[PDB]
From a paper:
Rsu-1 interacts with zinc-finger type multi-LIM domain-containing adaptor protein PINCH-1, known to be involved in the integrin-mediated consensus adhesome, but not with its highly homologous family member PINCH-2. Rsu-1 does not have catalytic activity but its primary sequence analysis indicates a leucine-rich repeat (LRR)-containing protein that implicates for protein-binding functions. We also showed that Rsu-1 can be assembled, via PINCH-1-binding, into a heteropentamer complex comprising Rsu-1, PINCH-1, ILK, Parvin, and Kindlin-2, which constitute a major consensus integrin adhesome crucial for focal adhesion assembly.
To gain structural insight into the architecture of Rsu-1, we first crystallized and solved its crystal structure by a single-wavelength anomalous dispersion (SAD) method using a single selenomethionine (SeMet)-substituted crystal. The structure of Rsu-1 was refined at 1.76-Å resolution to an Rwork of 17.3% and an Rfree of 21.7% with good stereochemistry. The terminal helix (residues 240–251) in the C-terminal cap region then folds toward the convex surface of the LRR region. Although Rsu-1 comprises two distinct variable sequence lengths (23- and 25-residues) in the LRRs that resemble in part those in the plant-specific (PS) subfamily in the LRR superfamily, our structural analysis strongly suggests that Rsu-1 falls into the SDS22-like subfamily rather than the PS subfamily.
Residue numbers in the entry: 2 to 251
The structure:
């Protein structure tokens, strides 16, 4: 409805904290006159546009807590993105990211990271990625991960972890350290066994979610999935499963 000029000018003159520029055909953030003068705004929505980059100028939006780039064509993020010290919610879903910039893990307030439908893999993650220990929800579904790095175990505030439809061949035993987890999505990968340490998690309730269908599970595990998720968790806690799991690797 409103022009981009009016959105910027009204945000500034009335000290308004949220700016909605979703679905406006924007191909370059530098084209939006005055956008980077809004050092006070807390929410910027640029979903459903045609961005292919995010300029380093993003660092001038120092008050941002919510940044939504869902469904653009973004191919890389500037390293300056990690200077957003108030950023709590970052939605980069449905873009074309193959890497995250060095220092990305330096974001001190990040709670929700949506990276669904990109082209990320374990090699995409910078060295300091798992210093993001404020994270409570990490959405990585429909990416290209083949393994999950063991430092995932550092993210002990995580309540939601989505790894749906990646290419995972294993889960690290360090997943067992995520004792606040309520939702784990691992359906649609290439998983054959589960680390016994996943049995440390209670994902059996109506309140918890464990989605794990559509994996090439070994026969004993597949048999337990037929009986129900609680049966899977009991099985992988057993000493006999620990025995066979150790032998199956070798």
């Amino acid at each position: 409805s409103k022009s981009l000029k009016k959105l910027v000018e009204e945000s500034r003159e009335k000290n308004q904290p949220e700016v909605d520029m979703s679905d406006r055909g924007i191909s370059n953030m530098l084209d939006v006159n005055g956008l980077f003068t809004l050092s006070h705004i807390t929410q910027l929505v640029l979903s459903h546009n045609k961005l292919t980059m995010v300029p380093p100028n993003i660092a001038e939006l120092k008050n941002l807590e919510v940044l939504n780039f869902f469904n653009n064509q973004i191919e890389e993020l500037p390293t300056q993105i990690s200077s957003l010290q108030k950023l709590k919610h970052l939605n980069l879903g449905m873009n074309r990211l193959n890497t995250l910039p060095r220092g990305f893990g330096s974001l001190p307030a990040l709670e929700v990271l949506d990276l669904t439908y990109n082209n990320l893999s374990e090699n995409s993650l910078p060295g300091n990625f798992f210093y993001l220990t404020t994270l409570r929800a990490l959405y990585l579904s429909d990416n290209d991960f083949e393994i999950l790095p063991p430092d995932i175990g550092k993210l002990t505030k995580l309540q939601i972890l989505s790894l749906r439809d990646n290419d995972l061949i294993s889960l690290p035993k360090e997943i067992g350290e995520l004792t606040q987890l309520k939702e784990l999505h691992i359906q649609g990968n290439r998983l054959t066994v589960l680390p016994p340490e996943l049995g440390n998690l209670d994902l059996t309730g109506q309140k918890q979610v464990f989605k794990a269908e559509n994996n090439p599970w070994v026969t004993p595990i597949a048999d337990q999935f037929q009986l129900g998720v609680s049966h899977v968790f009991e099985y992988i806690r057993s000493e006999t499963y620990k025995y066979l799991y150790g032998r199956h690797m070798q």
